[PDB]
Design a protein around this ligand. Sequence first.
Ligand SMILES: [K+]
Ligand SMILES: [Mg+2]
Ligand SMILES: [Mg+2]
Ligand SMILES: [Mg+2]
Ligand SMILES: [Mg+2]
Ligand SMILES: [Mg+2]
Ligand SMILES: [Mg+2]
Ligand SMILES: [Mg+2]
Ligand SMILES: [Mg+2]
Ligand SMILES: [Mg+2]
Lengths: 73, 133, 47, 118, 59, 175
Amino acid sequence: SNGRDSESKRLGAKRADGQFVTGGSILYRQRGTKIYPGTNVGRGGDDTLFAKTDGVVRFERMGRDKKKVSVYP
Amino acid sequence: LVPKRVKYRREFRGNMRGRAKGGTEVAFGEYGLQAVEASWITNRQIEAARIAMTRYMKRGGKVWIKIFPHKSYTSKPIGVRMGKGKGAPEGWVSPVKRGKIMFEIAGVPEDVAREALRLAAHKLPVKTKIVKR
Amino acid sequence: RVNITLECTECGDRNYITTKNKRENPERIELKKYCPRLRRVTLHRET
Amino acid sequence: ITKIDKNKVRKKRHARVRSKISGTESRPRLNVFRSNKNIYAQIIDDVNGVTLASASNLDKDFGSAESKVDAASKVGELVAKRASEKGITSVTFDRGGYLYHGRVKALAEAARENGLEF
Amino acid sequence: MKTGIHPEYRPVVFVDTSTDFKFLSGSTKSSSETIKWEDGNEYPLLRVEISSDSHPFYT
Amino acid sequence: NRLKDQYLKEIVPALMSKFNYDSVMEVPKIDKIVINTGVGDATANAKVLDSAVEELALITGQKPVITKAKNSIAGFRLREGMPIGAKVTLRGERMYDFLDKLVTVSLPRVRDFRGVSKKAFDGRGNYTLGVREQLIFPEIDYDQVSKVRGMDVVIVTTAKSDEESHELLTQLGMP
RNA sequence: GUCAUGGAGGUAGAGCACUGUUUGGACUAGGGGCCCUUCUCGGGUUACCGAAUUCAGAUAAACUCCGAAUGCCAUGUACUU
RNA sequence: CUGGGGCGGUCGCCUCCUAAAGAGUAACGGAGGCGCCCAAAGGUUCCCUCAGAAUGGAUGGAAAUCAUUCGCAGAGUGUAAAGGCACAAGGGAGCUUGACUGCGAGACUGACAAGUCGAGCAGGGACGAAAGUCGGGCUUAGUGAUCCGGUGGUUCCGCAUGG
RNA sequence: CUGGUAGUUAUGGCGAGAAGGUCACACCCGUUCCCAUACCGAACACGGUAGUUAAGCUUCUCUGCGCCAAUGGUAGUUGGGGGCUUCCCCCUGCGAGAGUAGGUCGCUGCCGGG
Ligand SMILES: [K+]
Ligand SMILES: [Mg+2]
Ligand SMILES: [Mg+2]
Ligand SMILES: [Mg+2]
Ligand SMILES: [Mg+2]
Ligand SMILES: [Mg+2]
Ligand SMILES: [Mg+2]
Ligand SMILES: [Mg+2]
Ligand SMILES: [Mg+2]
Ligand SMILES: [Mg+2]
């Protein structure tokens, strides 16, 4: 009666803290906001975080419990 | 001893590495039976050990069972090949790790405590030490 | 619930497919949609 | 029964506004505070965390009003002016959590009437 | 207060018949009867069963 | 206006002098009176509610708000939404008017009364006057109505203790 | 490849903050035994049951207030290859 | 397919555990869902805060609707589960149809076929005072290629030429 | 000193106690006007300043709850070795969670009035 599972969706970080990215680079794939859109970062319809401009990726604490990812030129 | 209900009917066997994380110092009683090596203790063995203890004390003093058989185990019948999914739940066990105090007694003199506990130890599949608070 | 096509009242063409529950919306749906032919918003009605 | 703290619940609404609106050096925030008596405007940079232009209902300049709305129009007129002098054009209006209606509206309408582009 | 939603709030005088006391208190249901007390500020009138002053538990 | 005046003339000091309050601000006042009907039968027939609203309106001189159920209960045969009972909140002058008509004209139309039932304070400072029937209120006329429903009258005070509340309701005239 | 630096990630361990499983004690609303006018409504009774409440104590692949070693991604004007 | 084969069960998609703290990872391993729904349950503007308990109170009961107090969430989120969400992503109301047309730097995923995200540009709009947000829905299932047929459109072709 | 508005993982919160006020800020008074309530001028909005620090606010005090937090030890574990092996031991490096000594009743801006 078991024997089922969905295809794995390859979630998680796609670029490293300190790595240079081009505009549109997906930074994080996620369900909901495990990580929040920081500065120069957008949240897509499926919660995907992407760089809005070229620059360097920085994963940062938001405050105590939450986390954000930013892109600094 | 059986859980009134369980979230999952089937459960990994697990492992028994390391010293018991809790219940290593005798807490409610004067004397305790301490597991020296690890083992699964079945509910049938806990009962056999309890009745042996309690009978010798002659409904005197108190007996705390400090282990509970939370974990189900399954078996396949004889004449059944491998596969076709996990077997039916057969029994209930408490994985006892080394250092875990399994039984505690109070309200009897040392001599009677120490005898009731050796009588219990002979029903358990694990090497035991008697320890006092 | 059914697939629906909205026809442009001016353009004539129907380049908008939608869906509706036809029990709850038995009438023909009317939406204002951009008509690419006319390059402006026009009333579109279910066929 | 407990009286509601009007400013506490106001400050809650202000947070909801400041969620979308924040001053920048190129384009600062025109924030309004409204009391039972008098009104106050500050043009702020949240990036630097510094108030540029500012104006109250109790500055030595313009101390003659008929109604609190007229009073609040004088403030807009003055904060617009004081901002233009400092050399800042495009702001974003921060309702401060107040309904964009009576006074705060009249402060904006007025500021907007002078050289401030929102 | 919204308009054209609630009925009239119009003031009206209540008077107990027995003790013959009078007091103003706005209410619905006019009845259209003149009053003696403060007739200049004319209000309707309502004849009433024993009030607090009359009722024996109170007095 | 007959009762509020009185509350501002010769209750405030009298009541401040009884408890010895530091400021007149501490003096208990009545915030709101809230009448609630509780038409549960309405789950069967909606027209029964229409009457229960119209009659309640006349009592308060202020159209009520038809309260809608919160959770689904099979026992009462009730489901999310569906109107059950009407609320109406009296504040200011139009409230004191009611309180007056409740303590002056309305209550001595019942068969009997003990008084300010000590058992009927919430323990915070607010009083709930349990009204048996609706023919107690003179703006009702039972020869123009079908069913009695009943009523529930909640009096919310600024008072901190039932003791402080009790004195205020007493000196306002409530039995 | 190593060094240095930054980062994502919840395993081992641990813990009980949540969810499930669970022991003992104290408390305490009910229900069930036992007589009474009684409608066993409520008393006088209670370790026959029992839901919360706390105190102490356990437990978890599909629990987590926590959380490694490693491994992984990257940066370097570092040293080797 | 299959701890020989048959019989039984299963076959695509989504969520979790197995899965060894990136990603991925098997078994006729352990658990559940899907083959839709919604004209608002979409967009935007504004406003809001839930479960439960205690106490008091007509019908009214353990439990309906009032009122106060305590309550980080013990609720809710169309629907499984996980991850999220109280500046709400939860709940009201007003106006609406962006559940737009042309696209798309660049990324993810990936044998291929496919799948996913996307700033920004142009056209013309909705809401908003503005800032701005809007190319459906908290997110991740709700689907099926080609060939062949049907219907609508069409500044394309039309077997000497016009059709 | 106080009002406004920011930053900062609550060392910033909660709770308890005290003091303060015409300069603000509040509550507060009123509904004619703009604008409001699915009923309610409660709120929102508008116009006021008789009354009051009671509350919010501000300042001060405290460690009851929370929060922060070493050192040491221990669990675990990379690499290298051994055993009698449900598992356990040794070497090297890393090193928790709990508990604890301790810390905390914030700190750091800019603008207006005084
Ligand atoms: K043995
Ligand atoms: Mg898989
Ligand atoms: Mg979508
Ligand atoms: Mg473990
Ligand atoms: Mg775990
Ligand atoms: Mg075989
Ligand atoms: Mg076989
Ligand atoms: Mg993984
Ligand atoms: Mg064809
Ligand atoms: Mg031809």
